[PDB]
Design a protein around this nucleic acid. Structure first.
Ligand SMILES: [Mg+2]
Ligand SMILES: [Mg+2]
Ligand SMILES: [Mg+2]
Ligand SMILES: [Mg+2]
Ligand SMILES: [Mg+2]
Ligand SMILES: [Mg+2]
Ligand SMILES: [Mg+2]
Ligand SMILES: [Mg+2]
Ligand SMILES: [Mg+2]
Ligand SMILES: [Mg+2]
Ligand SMILES: [Mg+2]
Ligand SMILES: [Mg+2]
Ligand SMILES: [Mg+2]
Ligand SMILES: [Mg+2]
Ligand SMILES: [Mg+2]
Ligand SMILES: [Mg+2]
Ligand SMILES: [Mg+2]
Ligand SMILES: [Mg+2]
Ligand SMILES: [Mg+2]
Ligand SMILES: [Mg+2]
Ligand SMILES: [Mg+2]
Ligand SMILES: [Mg+2]
Ligand SMILES: [Mg+2]
Ligand SMILES: [Mg+2]
Ligand SMILES: [Mg+2]
Ligand SMILES: [Mg+2]
Ligand SMILES: [Mg+2]
Ligand SMILES: [Mg+2]
Ligand SMILES: [Mg+2]
Ligand SMILES: [Mg+2]
Ligand SMILES: [Mg+2]
Ligand SMILES: [Mg+2]
Ligand SMILES: [Mg+2]
Ligand SMILES: [Mg+2]
Ligand SMILES: [Mg+2]
Ligand SMILES: [Mg+2]
Ligand SMILES: [Mg+2]
Ligand SMILES: [Mg+2]
Ligand SMILES: [Mg+2]
Ligand SMILES: [Mg+2]
Ligand SMILES: [Mg+2]
Ligand SMILES: [Mg+2]
Ligand SMILES: [Mg+2]
Ligand SMILES: [Mg+2]
Ligand SMILES: [Mg+2]
Ligand SMILES: [Mg+2]
Ligand SMILES: [Mg+2]
Ligand SMILES: [Mg+2]
Ligand SMILES: [Mg+2]
Ligand SMILES: [Mg+2]
Ligand SMILES: [Mg+2]
Ligand SMILES: [Mg+2]
Ligand SMILES: [Mg+2]
Ligand SMILES: [Mg+2]
Ligand SMILES: [Mg+2]
Ligand SMILES: [Mg+2]
Ligand SMILES: [Mg+2]
Ligand SMILES: [Mg+2]
Ligand SMILES: [Mg+2]
Ligand SMILES: [Mg+2]
Ligand SMILES: [Mg+2]
Ligand SMILES: [Mg+2]
Ligand SMILES: [Mg+2]
Ligand SMILES: [Mg+2]
Ligand SMILES: [Mg+2]
Ligand SMILES: [Mg+2]
Ligand SMILES: [Mg+2]
Ligand SMILES: [Mg+2]
Ligand SMILES: [Mg+2]
Ligand SMILES: [Mg+2]
Ligand SMILES: [Mg+2]
Ligand SMILES: [Mg+2]
Ligand SMILES: [Mg+2]
Ligand SMILES: [Mg+2]
Ligand SMILES: [Mg+2]
Ligand SMILES: [Mg+2]
Ligand SMILES: [Mg+2]
Ligand SMILES: [Mg+2]
Ligand SMILES: [Mg+2]
Ligand SMILES: [Mg+2]
Ligand SMILES: [Mg+2]
Ligand SMILES: [Mg+2]
Ligand SMILES: [Mg+2]
Ligand SMILES: [Mg+2]
Ligand SMILES: [Mg+2]
Ligand SMILES: [Mg+2]
Ligand SMILES: [Mg+2]
Ligand SMILES: [Mg+2]
Ligand SMILES: [Mg+2]
Ligand SMILES: [Mg+2]
Ligand SMILES: [Mg+2]
Ligand SMILES: [Mg+2]
Ligand SMILES: [Mg+2]
Ligand SMILES: [Mg+2]
Ligand SMILES: [Mg+2]
Ligand SMILES: [Mg+2]
Ligand SMILES: [Mg+2]
Ligand SMILES: [Mg+2]
Ligand SMILES: [Mg+2]
Ligand SMILES: [Mg+2]
Ligand SMILES: [Mg+2]
Ligand SMILES: [Mg+2]
Ligand SMILES: [Mg+2]
Ligand SMILES: [Mg+2]
Ligand SMILES: [Mg+2]
Ligand SMILES: [Mg+2]
Ligand SMILES: [Mg+2]
Ligand SMILES: [Mg+2]
Ligand SMILES: [Mg+2]
Ligand SMILES: [Mg+2]
Ligand SMILES: [Mg+2]
Ligand SMILES: [Mg+2]
Ligand SMILES: [Mg+2]
Ligand SMILES: [Mg+2]
Ligand SMILES: [Mg+2]
Ligand SMILES: [Mg+2]
Ligand SMILES: [Mg+2]
Ligand SMILES: [Mg+2]
Ligand SMILES: [Mg+2]
Ligand SMILES: [Mg+2]
Ligand SMILES: [Mg+2]
Ligand SMILES: [Mg+2]
Ligand SMILES: [Mg+2]
Ligand SMILES: [Mg+2]
Ligand SMILES: [Mg+2]
Ligand SMILES: [Mg+2]
Ligand SMILES: [Mg+2]
Ligand SMILES: [Mg+2]
Ligand SMILES: [Mg+2]
Ligand SMILES: [Mg+2]
Ligand SMILES: [Mg+2]
Ligand SMILES: [Mg+2]
Ligand SMILES: [Mg+2]
Ligand SMILES: [Mg+2]
Ligand SMILES: [Mg+2]
Ligand SMILES: [Mg+2]
Ligand SMILES: [Mg+2]
Ligand SMILES: [Mg+2]
Ligand SMILES: [Mg+2]
Ligand SMILES: [Mg+2]
Ligand SMILES: [Mg+2]
Ligand SMILES: [Mg+2]
Ligand SMILES: [Mg+2]
Ligand SMILES: [Mg+2]
Ligand SMILES: [Mg+2]
Ligand SMILES: [Mg+2]
Ligand SMILES: [Mg+2]
Ligand SMILES: [Mg+2]
Ligand SMILES: [Mg+2]
Ligand SMILES: [Mg+2]
Ligand SMILES: [Mg+2]
Ligand SMILES: [Mg+2]
Ligand SMILES: [Mg+2]
Lengths: 48, 271
RNA sequence: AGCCUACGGGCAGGCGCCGAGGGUAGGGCCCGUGACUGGGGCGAAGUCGUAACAAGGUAGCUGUACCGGAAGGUGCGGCUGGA
RNA sequence: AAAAUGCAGU
RNA sequence: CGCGGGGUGGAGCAGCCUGGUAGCUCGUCGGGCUCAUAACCCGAAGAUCGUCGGUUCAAAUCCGGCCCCCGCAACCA
RNA sequence: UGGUUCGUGGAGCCAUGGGGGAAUCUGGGCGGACCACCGCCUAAGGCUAAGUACUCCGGGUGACCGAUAGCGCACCAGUAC
RNA sequence: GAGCUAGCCCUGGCCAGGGUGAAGCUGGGGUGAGACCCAGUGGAGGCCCGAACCGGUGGGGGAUGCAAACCCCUCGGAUGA
RNA sequence: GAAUGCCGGCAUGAGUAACGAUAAAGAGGGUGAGAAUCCCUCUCGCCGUAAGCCCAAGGGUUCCUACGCAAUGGUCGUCAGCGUAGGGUUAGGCGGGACCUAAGGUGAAGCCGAAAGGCGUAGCCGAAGGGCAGCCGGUUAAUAUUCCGGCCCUUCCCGCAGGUGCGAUGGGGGGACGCUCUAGGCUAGGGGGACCGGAGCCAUGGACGAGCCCGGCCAGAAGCGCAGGGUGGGAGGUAGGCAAAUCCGCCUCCCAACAAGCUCUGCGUGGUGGGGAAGCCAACCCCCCGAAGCCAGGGAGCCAAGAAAAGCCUCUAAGCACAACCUGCGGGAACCCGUACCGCAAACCGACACAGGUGGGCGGGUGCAAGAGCACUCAGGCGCGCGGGAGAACCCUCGCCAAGGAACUCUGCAAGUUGGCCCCGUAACUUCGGGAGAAGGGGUGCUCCCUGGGGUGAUGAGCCCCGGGGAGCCGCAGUGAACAGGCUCUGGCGACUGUUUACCAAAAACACAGCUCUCUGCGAACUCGUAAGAGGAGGUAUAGGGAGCGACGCUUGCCCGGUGCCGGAAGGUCAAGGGGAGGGGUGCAAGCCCCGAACCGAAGCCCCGGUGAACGGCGGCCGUAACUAUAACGGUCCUAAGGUAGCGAAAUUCCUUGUCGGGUAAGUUCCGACCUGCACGAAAAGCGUAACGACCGGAGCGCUGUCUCGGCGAGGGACCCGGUGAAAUUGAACUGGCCGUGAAGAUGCGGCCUACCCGUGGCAGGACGAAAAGACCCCGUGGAGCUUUACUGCAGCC
RNA sequence: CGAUGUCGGCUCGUCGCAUCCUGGGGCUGAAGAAGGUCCCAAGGGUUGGGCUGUUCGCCCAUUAAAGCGGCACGCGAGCUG
């Protein structure tokens, strides 16, 4: 039936955004963590 | 006056709405600096703080004059009596001669085109406001302030009304609608007469809906929840509570007094 | 489409209306009877009290309402058919 | 103030 | 099958913890008061203390075995 | 109340959230309650190398591994997924 | 982590067709005046039937499925909470 | 060599199940190395409120073209959404942005918090809402309101002419609002035509026919009509719009008003531009139906009373009047992003080309009462990416059945009957609405004749919309197929519509209007937060929070001993702290240090009293009536008080299938009764109750393959052949019966018996078959949720 | 207990005999017909409903009779629940 993943761009960008991250101390420390691991994307890459 | 319906459908037989002859004359509220974006929302910064709120018909706000001492001595003609979704009483719209217009919790009797005013002198009668001190010991009165220059706060719902019980110096004693005998400062204003729409207390919602149209979501009994939720909850098989009626938060609900103890607000009470 | 024919006609035969009654369905009135149940009338010497009749030992009666093993009691009002 | 009852027929 | 409480004059109950005394209401019997009956007044009479054994100097009383009574249990399957 | 070895213990010292509240050397704290002796030391401003720590980084080594080991990755790996 | 789900807030959209026929008005009757009674008009309702849409009654099938909740027949709401 | 071990490889099950909707195929041409599967054509079937068109979201080159077939495609592939390469997406007017504001977010000022950070005014951000200028054609292999053609617009800048007190972030108006019902005109859309325009056709017995067949429009400035939507003009005063105003707003004054004018739309018409069927390698007209769309800010009614801001008018402030606006007309200027393609799906969410899920618009025609339903069908799109035979059992889905007719069974579960529209005609009971579609009947097709109103016209023909009567025809049958209630009686529970355990429970559970109790006088009580702040509420006792009950009707007894809550300026106790009698350590001392009794000291608790729609409770044993029997009466013990009404073998009754009565041939169920109620009882309400119910029980009628009891038949599998080809499982196996034996249920030991070797289709007795380190049970000084008068703490509160 | 699915029903049976019928047969308080009891004997039979989840019973209507037990209270990789 109507599964859990209902893709929306404005959502994804706004929830897991690079800006959204930077805005919370918890969110800032997420990036810090990723950059430090070498991930190629930090913020779930989207596009509009 | 309360209108009743025929049984042409259950939940109707019983239902009864408010008679709107008192109002009439004007339906749409006064566009003019009078309505506002009345913001629905059943709770503060996030969590709900008043369970079962919500739903309910869209509603515009009417800013009313809760301190008529604004325009002292300036007399006005009561232009119309309109309906107000925001409250139980009816509000009356009045054009001042000052040009200006504004609303005012429509007192019982106040009639159209009749003139009214407020001042430390106005003819003691329906719709006039004057510092409590100048009002004849006895004469009823609504939209009473509680402290000089802080707006009406007492007696505002259909039928409410306090009575001047007697003077006592800087102060004056009032027997509020609840029956508590309060001492309100002499300067506090208050407009002569009662509130009107007294029939309010008789309308029977009728159906479970309506209760909803008012923005009241079903209210479940503690009894019906589980130990986890409410305290009454739980028990395998319907229960007799289990000593001594309590609220979802703890505190007893049958009799336990709550008003603050050492509230400086005493000293002016009795009842 | 037969018969006798006195031949546009008559009979037989055919179709239709109605039609006794039978059928089905649903109502109404009356009578009988029914576990159980409600009081009622009656029946020589039963059990409990004593309400009423003499200020019946709390005047009586009354419409009503509530209560009580039972008569009855009490409230409100009413009558005198009590003072 | 308080204080009940008296078998059947005759 | 288990864990309980109980048994005493006619009746309904006490004394049984902590032994030597058997208490109360009622009823019963004998007298009064009434024309008489109740009701009232005065005076009594009646109790293997459920049985059997044990303990003690002495047991209804403390101790166990039975015999009858009225309670509560009998759960997961 | 915390810190110390110190868990209220005879509990001093060192900090200090509350109340009260000095003196400037005849001033004032300490020497494990407290007195007295005797002795130490100058609180309520600050600064100060070095010896100490660590290994993203470069180098040298190994009775270290040798592609299921060794870092997760000897390879276009924080990738594919 | 409320892109599922639960509630609420702001703003939009959606609900074939058919039926029943409340309040009101209006005329007639009625009375001292009324209540009221009649037709007509009227078009109410968590009203009725039933598609969309929202469900999930009962049965069967499915059960290494078409599917980690599906399909068939059937059934409830369908101007409202 | 074992850890249901870890990683990897390869086995077995097995050429087995399967190959993803039973909408469906056949053939002839091509192409090629090879074609059931690619291309073409001709038959055939399926969808057609879609299985067709457009738009959004999401996906992201999947688009078009040319080469290709390793793999991907449940088979095949010459094909492709695959690989490789090359093309392809054009905007002042469509959509976003150099506009607006909503929720919400952010946040100068300001408030708060160990830090992190939390609030918060304005402002800012924020869109499917407000605002705003493009229509019809033509082109490409692939883009088009984007390029092109025709017609028509919008801003800005400048010059010019002619106008006027011009001018704000400021003031005012407007923007501007709900739901249900609707008028009058239109348009979209559609149906006809005896008319216009057309290639053609007369077959197979007849028709050269007012024949058949095809099509008879679209867009359109200014002006003009026809529908509407908006709108009083004057002129004086002014205490108001946080006056800066000749604008709003108020009063007063002529005139004027189911209006005119002035405006603004929509629709016709319009110069003119465009398109333009069926057929064999060029008209463009007239009737009729008609919107859920337009005129739109239309109108009525209703109660629950229906965003904001900018654009836009208008008013004045400084300012500035050489500016400036305003109207014209010309010239010029007009950026950024998006635009391919999929888009109910093989390109989106579901690991898959997945029978699931996905918002908005169009959604033709005929018939059936209607309709978005149902059957068929246009347009357009599809036959579902394995096929070919066979015609066993067995399963699925489907059709029919003799006589019987619920005997089936836990249960009529399932299936059958009934089934639309019209007319008759419908009971108890009732809250008078209803029950009611109660039940139970009749009608239903086509043909001819007569005849009634309506709409459009024009009054009159056509064209449509309702009808009424009379004869008559054929069938087994006329809602001739499809969509399409089985009905009644009677209990229980709940009033009722509603809500729930996504994914085993839809209920008698939750909710519900309504009743009661209680809290709360406003910086309310309550909730969230450390706080600031916020909800409560821009409310104010007819209001708000908590609690129980749960429409309505008749009602809701007795017990404050204990418990809770409420009231008690006395008493009793009580911690700091006050107070210091009096004692102690040290000094030679002044002193310094220590203990420390009287008494005074809060809340709380004890204590007094209230309190039941507050927690809660609401008895026993003897006796007695003139037949017995029983006990209205009595005695006695105990209590805080001993269960009232009403109901009662019940969702409650153990004994129990109580015992009577009813229904039945027969009734542990069922209905009515009785009452020794193991163990009903009054807002954890008691007893009832019309109506309602996918709720649970009992009975009848109707009908039936449920059954006596099976039989035949259809199709999709199962079976054979070609093609692709898994799975759990698996110590190894050369894996028979009986009677014993064995850790107690043996293919495997013993004795006897039977037994050539290997498969195929079938059935499930056994392999203590598979699958889950059993849910139950106990064990563990394992764990979690919950509880309270367990312990001990903390928030909170006094 | 790293699972031996647990009542009853339905379907399919098969076995024991301590036999409900039907066949033999001795006693009898067996006249007859019937009955009682015991002996031998399962070869084959051993009904259909009402009530209950029931096994079991109890009834209804028949019968020659309406037997009792075992098979993991036979039988859920056979069904029902
Ligand atoms: Mg969203
Ligand atoms: Mg906020
Ligand atoms: Mg937030
Ligand atoms: Mg509730
Ligand atoms: Mg619950
Ligand atoms: Mg929770
Ligand atoms: Mg709790
Ligand atoms: Mg409870
Ligand atoms: Mg007849
Ligand atoms: Mg009778
Ligand atoms: Mg008397
Ligand atoms: Mg007397
Ligand atoms: Mg008397
Ligand atoms: Mg008595
Ligand atoms: Mg009395
Ligand atoms: Mg009297
Ligand atoms: Mg007597
Ligand atoms: Mg005699
Ligand atoms: Mg005793
Ligand atoms: Mg005795
Ligand atoms: Mg005597
Ligand atoms: Mg003894
Ligand atoms: Mg003795
Ligand atoms: Mg004894
Ligand atoms: Mg137990
Ligand atoms: Mg247990
Ligand atoms: Mg300090
Ligand atoms: Mg010190
Ligand atoms: Mg010291
Ligand atoms: Mg020392
Ligand atoms: Mg220093
Ligand atoms: Mg290095
Ligand atoms: Mg090496
Ligand atoms: Mg090595
Ligand atoms: Mg490695
Ligand atoms: Mg190697
Ligand atoms: Mg959500
Ligand atoms: Mg639609
Ligand atoms: Mg409708
Ligand atoms: Mg009417
Ligand atoms: Mg409805
Ligand atoms: Mg419906
Ligand atoms: Mg649901
Ligand atoms: Mg439905
Ligand atoms: Mg229905
Ligand atoms: Mg709504
Ligand atoms: Mg080993
Ligand atoms: Mg492996
Ligand atoms: Mg096999
Ligand atoms: Mg096979
Ligand atoms: Mg196969
Ligand atoms: Mg397929
Ligand atoms: Mg080739
Ligand atoms: Mg060839
Ligand atoms: Mg979406
Ligand atoms: Mg996109
Ligand atoms: Mg690609
Ligand atoms: Mg090609
Ligand atoms: Mg290939
Ligand atoms: Mg292939
Ligand atoms: Mg392609
Ligand atoms: Mg390609
Ligand atoms: Mg252009
Ligand atoms: Mg903005
Ligand atoms: Mg913030
Ligand atoms: Mg804000
Ligand atoms: Mg918009
Ligand atoms: Mg635009
Ligand atoms: Mg295209
Ligand atoms: Mg162009
Ligand atoms: Mg000027
Ligand atoms: Mg047309
Ligand atoms: Mg022609
Ligand atoms: Mg005017
Ligand atoms: Mg003016
Ligand atoms: Mg035109
Ligand atoms: Mg052409
Ligand atoms: Mg702005
Ligand atoms: Mg101006
Ligand atoms: Mg496109
Ligand atoms: Mg769609
Ligand atoms: Mg897909
Ligand atoms: Mg496919
Ligand atoms: Mg799919
Ligand atoms: Mg159609
Ligand atoms: Mg129809
Ligand atoms: Mg439509
Ligand atoms: Mg359809
Ligand atoms: Mg078709
Ligand atoms: Mg086949
Ligand atoms: Mg048959
Ligand atoms: Mg037949
Ligand atoms: Mg029949
Ligand atoms: Mg029957
Ligand atoms: Mg049977
Ligand atoms: Mg059925
Ligand atoms: Mg049917
Ligand atoms: Mg009847
Ligand atoms: Mg009924
Ligand atoms: Mg009918
Ligand atoms: Mg015909
Ligand atoms: Mg069909
Ligand atoms: Mg059919
Ligand atoms: Mg019952
Ligand atoms: Mg219900
Ligand atoms: Mg419901
Ligand atoms: Mg569920
Ligand atoms: Mg339901
Ligand atoms: Mg369910
Ligand atoms: Mg109060
Ligand atoms: Mg506040
Ligand atoms: Mg309840
Ligand atoms: Mg009391
Ligand atoms: Mg009490
Ligand atoms: Mg008390
Ligand atoms: Mg108190
Ligand atoms: Mg005190
Ligand atoms: Mg108690
Ligand atoms: Mg006797
Ligand atoms: Mg009978
Ligand atoms: Mg019976
Ligand atoms: Mg039955
Ligand atoms: Mg009964
Ligand atoms: Mg009882
Ligand atoms: Mg009770
Ligand atoms: Mg009570
Ligand atoms: Mg109660
Ligand atoms: Mg109830
Ligand atoms: Mg009922
Ligand atoms: Mg329902
Ligand atoms: Mg029956
Ligand atoms: Mg069958
Ligand atoms: Mg067959
Ligand atoms: Mg077949
Ligand atoms: Mg094969
Ligand atoms: Mg062998
Ligand atoms: Mg064996
Ligand atoms: Mg062997
Ligand atoms: Mg085989
Ligand atoms: Mg087997
Ligand atoms: Mg099998
Ligand atoms: Mg197993
Ligand atoms: Mg285990
Ligand atoms: Mg357990
Ligand atoms: Mg533990
Ligand atoms: Mg095992
Ligand atoms: Mg014999
Ligand atoms: Mg014989
Ligand atoms: Mg046998
Ligand atoms: Mg057997
Ligand atoms: Mg057994
Ligand atoms: Mg068994
Ligand atoms: Mg069950």
């Amino acid at each position: 039936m109507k599964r859990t993943w209902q893709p929306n761009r404005r959502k994804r960008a706004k929830t897991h955004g690079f800006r959204a991250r930077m805005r919370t101390p918890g969110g800032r420390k997420v990036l810090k963590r990723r950059r430090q691991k070498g991930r190629w994307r930090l913020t779930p890459a989207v596009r509009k | 006056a309360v209108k009743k319906f025929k049984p042409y459908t259950p939940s109707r037989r019983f239902m009864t709405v408010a008679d709107f002859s008192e109002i009439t004359k004007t339906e749409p509220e006064k566009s003019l600096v009078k309505p506002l974006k009345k913001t629905g929302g059943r709770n503060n910064q996030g969590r709900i703080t008043v369970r079962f709120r919500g739903g309910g018909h869209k509603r515009l706000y009417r800013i009313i004059d809760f301190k008529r001492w604004d325009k002292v001595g300036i007399p006005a003609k009561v232009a119309a009596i309109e309906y107000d979704p925001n409250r139980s009483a009816r509000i009356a719209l009045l054009h001042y001669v000052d040009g200006e217009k504004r609303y005012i919790i429509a007192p019982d009797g106040l009639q159209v085109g009749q003139q009214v005013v407020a001042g430390p002198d106005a003819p003691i009668q329906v719709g006039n406001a004057l510092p409590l001190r100048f009002i004849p010991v006895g004469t009823v009165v609504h939209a009473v302030e509680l402290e000089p220059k802080k707006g009406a706060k007492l007696a505002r719902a259909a039928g409410t009304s306090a009575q001047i019980q007697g003077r006592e110096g800087d102060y004056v004693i009032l027997r509020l609608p609840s029956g508590e005998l309060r001492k309100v400062h002499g300067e506090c204003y208050a407009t002569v007469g009662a509130v009107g729409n007294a029939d309010h207390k008789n309308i029977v919602l009728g159906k479970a809906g309506r209760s909803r149209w008012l923005g009241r979501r079903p209210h479940v009994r503690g009894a019906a929840m589980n130990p986890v939720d409410h305290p009454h909850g739980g028990g395998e098989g319907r229960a007799p509570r289990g000593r001594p009626p309590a609220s979802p938060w703890g505190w007893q609900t049958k009799g336990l007094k709550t008003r603050k103890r050492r509230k400086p607000s005493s000293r002016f009470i009795i009842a």
